[PDB]
Symmetry: D4
């Protein structure tokens, strides 16, 4: 990658539905070259894909939660618990962090009941789980994971 | 929205670079109709945009952090602090949650130094801030916020 | 339900021993109609009953406690523990909450000994229980659960 | 009070709409005597009133919260904060407890927004307030404060 | 007991080696009467004994500790653990408290090693023990348990 | 001090109302010598006094509390707060400890009200105080501070 | 040891590569005497050795961590866990402390991965371990354990 | 640096008082070359110095402490507090960490009093300090910061 690729990516991360023309003109380079670089970035895995950004409100996902999960210590209980958490419906993010030395899970649901049935009830039955602490998101001030180039 | 829109969205949330043909054939409907519904979903704000999914590794974003921030109580200190947190470079997510009754901030940086200079040092100077607790993400088991329809 | 029912309920939640006359006159509607609406609200479950409000002081209930209870994780240990907590004498409220992700139990007793014997000693023997934290209420600034319409 | 009064109260705490006849017959005493004792209990403040028990679901009170509030130390800041908490719409219970040495507040709302606007936003502006921690009740296993005689 | 007994006790709690004469004269009552009341207080268990107040410094008890102990929940594990804690050499106080819902243990030793060997090492082996948290007293501002009448 | 003094002290710490005869005979030494050693221990401050051991139950001291107090940092705020805590009626023990790095206060009262009025309300007004956490002692398994020689 | 030895040690703790001449002249004593005292301090174990002070940056040790570890209670689980922690590569310090009543572990690694593989993953498998909390050192303001004489 | 330098450093980190001969023979290289490489490592700052390893016991440093310090947020209060902590006598280590987002301070003293006077009392007066939590090290299982190459 070079400065050029950065400028292309900075644009694609915001709006991928621009035209080579539009982008070529903005970056000041040959359209065929731009098209080449983009194809390259994809082949190399810099660009992994293109997604439709959907507003969760539209889907009535009003019950947003962030849950911390403490794994019971023991052989591979941490690796196992991670993947189990990742496959739960509504869960879009799973991270193992240092400090609390546990898992942080980001999930979304339409309602409390949906949350209870699909997430909570299920997590409280998993073996490797010691404790969980759920924080109800009452306000999303910002959520733009797509912006990786500031 | 109807069941049809859901099927379209379920696909677009995964891969937006499919062709009307490909999607029309998969959903079993007229291409002109599909094209219409998609245009409608956009006009109505269900679909807010299309982004390029970039792998952060490729950008050397290796210092991933999740920080909780306690706001000092007082007139609008909470609303103010939120927006200040959202404008910090590298910060892609800001949430106000219940339980801890504070803010959860998701950010990414290339290094610790970058993290310190851009995020930490800056946050520790903000007035409305009482305390912060940073959790270093040592492993991302999953991060697919784009998947809103399970 | 309509605005009218709300006005009736707002009154009944405060004092149920008023007379149809008194209420009819206050709401400005036919007594037979009022009587009808009240009967309807009961049949529909809006109004579940009428209780005598007894001052706990009069019964010497001076040991008021609020206890948080952490359930040991495992198949249905949460559902089971809930109901066991609800059947303990003196316990009038049981809630499962998010944040602490546990149970909050409201109870009343005449003395510490009564509290120990009936509540504490009993709770500390239950299997599904991991930890409990009891907060001694030293002052009730307000307790009017009956007021549901503000 | 005597054993007799207890039996009367035990009944009235459950259902106050019984008839003297029904109660007299159950307690095995003269109706005029029963009527006397009840009048006495009221005059003495044992029985403070009669309420209609309304199901909160019927009023769409789905956002149930239990909030702990730490008061900033200083002359009468505790007494003041208590009463301010008690006058907030939706708040039906306020207790000062030992252990956490703070306030526990019980409130009900139709939605998160209502909760934010009426409760949270308001509490975060009060001077005497140091910190608050809100626990979202996701399940009421029991709530019968009216039962004071077990 | 009466006001008179209180005055006698208030004195004895401070200095028990006064003479009936000295006390009689101070309380303004017959020496034989005083002697009677004191004998009575003893027979009734108000006064359980007379002790020599020894300065711990003199015995080189420089390692003062206050330890909180969480008992593992289960049948009588709490009652058992209490008595086991009370019989440990150097331990002079054991209390079960509400809030932390555990045991608070007061002990004294000449050195850290003595503390480790006699107290810590021993407590960490007891079955019913879940966790312990030891606070090293670096300063005794006051310790006059003998003063029960202020 | 020598082994002999230890044996004398071990006895006096339990029961100070023994007679030189009784003690002399038990320790196997001349009564005049014993009397000398005891006088010496007093003059040297090993033995600071003799107290009457009074059972707090007899005085209706049923509200036993152990309170942790965090001092606000600043010039001598710690030294000042200590002495203020020590002069509060009912407070018999004050310790500054490491770990929590605060004060532990032992107090006794007849009732909750007495506790509130005399202790709590007063402590919550002191300037140097940041936070307090009160633990209600529901059971004294042991309290024998007088035993310094095990 | 005497004042003289202290002056010698104060110097050697800073720079051990000085010459007897240089030190003799600074301390104002015969070189043969100095040489004698140093040999003595070594034979007596005051001076245990001489080390090369290596800058960790030079070795790319950028992932510095401080981890607290709670041992599960049980026969010798504490002694065992200590030694297991001490033998982990990268771990240079292990302490058992009072307050948290656990272990504090100081370690260094080149990267997060190295940290995970060598330290974290390994610690999370040890039996006697209950919980761990890792604090990522983002800045070493000072690290001079070699200075024992201030 | 190369593999050779590593072998030299691995040795010097353990014992710096070996002779070029001894080291040359062990590493299998010319003494003049070894001498060159060592001089180079010093000039480049890999090797910053040579210290005498002194046993703290010998100096009666029996009061070992590890203190966490929370800085009050505000312009440069963190940078300032760090350096103030580093200049306190007995303090050999100061680290700013993530998780607790504070400072960890390692210090040594002969006694509790020395600890109080030199460290604690002094730290509790510093402005930028919010809270401190001291952990008394009762056992050093290992302390070999000099070993940077495992
Ligand atoms: Mg996207
Ligand atoms: Mg009622
Ligand atoms: Mg005594
Ligand atoms: Mg060294």
């Amino acid at each position: 990658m070079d400065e050029i690729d950065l400028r292309i990516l900075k644009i694609l991360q915001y709006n991928a539905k621009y035209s080579l023309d539009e982008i070529a003109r903005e970056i000041r380079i040959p359209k065929s070259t731009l098209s080449y670089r983009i194809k390259k970035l994809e082949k190399d895995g810099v660009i992994k894909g293109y997604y439709a950004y959907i507003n969760p409100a539209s889907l009535n996902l009003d019950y947003i939660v962030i849950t911390s999960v403490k794994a019971k210590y023991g052989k591979n209980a941490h690796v196992e618990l991670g993947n189990k958490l990742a496959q739960i419906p509504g869960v879009w993010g799973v991270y193992f962090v240092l400090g609390d030395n546990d898992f942080i899970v980001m999930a979304r649901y339409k309602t409390r009941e949906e949350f209870m049935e699909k997430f909570l009830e299920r997590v409280m039955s998993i073996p490797e789980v010691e404790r969980t602490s759920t924080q109800v998101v009452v306000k999303i001030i910002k959520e733009s994971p797509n912006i990786v180039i500031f």
